[PDB]
Design a protein around this nucleic acid. Structure first.
Length: 78
DNA sequence: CTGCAGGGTTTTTGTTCCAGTCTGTAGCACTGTGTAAGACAGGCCAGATC
């Protein structure tokens, strides 16, 4: 299964659809493989009615960052 | 029916190149702290003395 392979073997398996995503994002979306596959995953999540996971992913890949704000972290430290 | 020698197959796990790019950690300067080794004091008993 794709989730249990290593990243090297997963790339060896998925490189074809990878380069198809590359050429599609270059043809239509300014060559942004990042945002294209991001919105693809977002909509594939939202289709199953998994609204909490997709809302949390939209909250993560924008605005707030890694779990804590570095400012408040230093605030605690001091 | 059975035994391994060993053929195929993907998968994995390396893996070779450069660049990075973060990171931990081992520097570095520092002075404050706790100790144990060693100087040395003295008193004091034994040895030498009167």
């Amino acid at each position: 299964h794709l989730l249990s392979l290593t990243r090297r073997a997963q790339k060896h398996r998925l490189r074809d659809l990878k380069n198809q995503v590359k050429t599609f994002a270059e043809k239509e979306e300014g060559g942004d493989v990042k945002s294209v596959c991001l919105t693809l995953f977002l909509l594939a999540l939202r289709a199953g009615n998994e609204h909490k996971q997709a809302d949390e992913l939209e909250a993560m890949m924008q605005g707030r960052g890694f779990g804590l704000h570095p400012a408040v972290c230093l605030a605690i430290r001091v």
